[PDB]
Amino acid sequence: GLPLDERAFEKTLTPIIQEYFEHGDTNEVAEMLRDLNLGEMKSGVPVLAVSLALEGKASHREMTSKLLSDLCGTVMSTTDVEKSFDKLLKDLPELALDTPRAPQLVGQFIARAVGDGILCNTYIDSYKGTVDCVQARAALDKATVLLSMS
Ligand SMILES: [Cl-]
Ligand code: NA
Numbered sequence: 832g833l834p835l836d837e838r839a840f841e842k843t844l845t846p847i848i849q850e851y852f853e854h855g856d857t858n859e860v861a862e863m864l865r866d867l868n869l870g871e872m873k874s875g876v877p878v879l880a881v882s883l884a885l886e887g888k889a890s891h892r893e894m895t896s897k898l899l900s901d902l903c904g905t906v907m908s909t910t911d912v913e914k915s916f917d918k919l920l921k922d923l924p925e926l927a928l929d930t931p932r933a934p935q936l937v938g939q940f941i942a943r944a945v946g947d948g949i950l951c952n953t954y955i956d957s958y959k960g961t962v963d964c965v966q967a968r969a970a971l972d973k974a975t976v977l978l979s980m981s
Contacts, residue, residue, distance in 0.1 A: 834872045841879060843867075848880050852891045857901040864906040873907045877915035878922065881940055885930045892936060896943040903949040912949045916941060920958075923966040934966050938973025945978060 834840075847863050864876065877899050884895040903912050919937055926933040944950035955971055955978075962968050 834875060840872050840875055844879050848883050857898050861906050873911045874914035878918045881919055885933050885936055900947040900949060909949055920967040927966055934969040935973045937970040941974035942977035
């Protein structure tokens, strides 16, 4: 349904993710998440990580895809991951204000998640003809293109 402690959540996880962009140890992030024992807010981690990476270096975005692959199956499930991308698609209109190419970059995050097997290959299809948001559509379309040339 609805997540709890969202505002505090962002305040607590942001420094942890930013630090990860520098040390590159996904196990450090995993330990912090085990300490927090997050409820449904588990799905909020990928969204925040992606959101911060969008405004960072291209290397941070690659490190983020790696983090998602590592965390899935350890501190969160594919179900949490799918919920995270659903949230990401919804936040796209706001994210694009700071990063115009956010849709395309989210497209790569989606393609990579499907490649790493943490996001079902039918995820994109399910949204085919169910999305009104042109930004979400652009992200899904970019993901489709990237997966065709995989
Ligand atoms: Cl393209
Ligand atoms: Na990934």
